[PDB]
Amino acid sequence: GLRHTFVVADATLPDCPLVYASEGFYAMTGYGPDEVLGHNCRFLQGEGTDPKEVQKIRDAIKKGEACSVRLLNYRKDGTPFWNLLTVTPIKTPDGRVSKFVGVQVDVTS
């Protein structure tokens, strides 16, 4: 299929820290696990990131809904790329959100 990356965020912590990332994510972004795990995904954002889209994900996470936004992100070396990003809430049987899982596709084409 298409080249994509995958992460898991822990929603049982107040600021959805990332707890797992596929090989592709580290390779796409240039950041290592020591700089990715424990942190919130937003460190990939920068000057040109549309705050109206950042808002759509903030709201969707607060409400525990899925969400798909297209964000401008930056690699560790500062070069930008276009991140088509899809967040999925993972609920426990009691209805609580336990994790958010994300598929991120570099759609710079």
Ligand SMILES: *[C@@]12=NC3=[C]C([C])=C([C])[C]=C3N([C][C]([O])[C]([O])[C]([O])[C]OP([O])([O])=O)C1=NC(=O)[N]C2=O
């Ligand atoms: C990021 N991917 C990503 C993956 C998951 C599973 C989740 C839950 C979030 C992201 N983000 C966004 C970030 O964590 C945050 O949710 C939003 O920026 C909005 O909240 P704030 O407090 O910042 O307004 C991702 N952000 C990226 O920029 N790139 C991704 O790959």
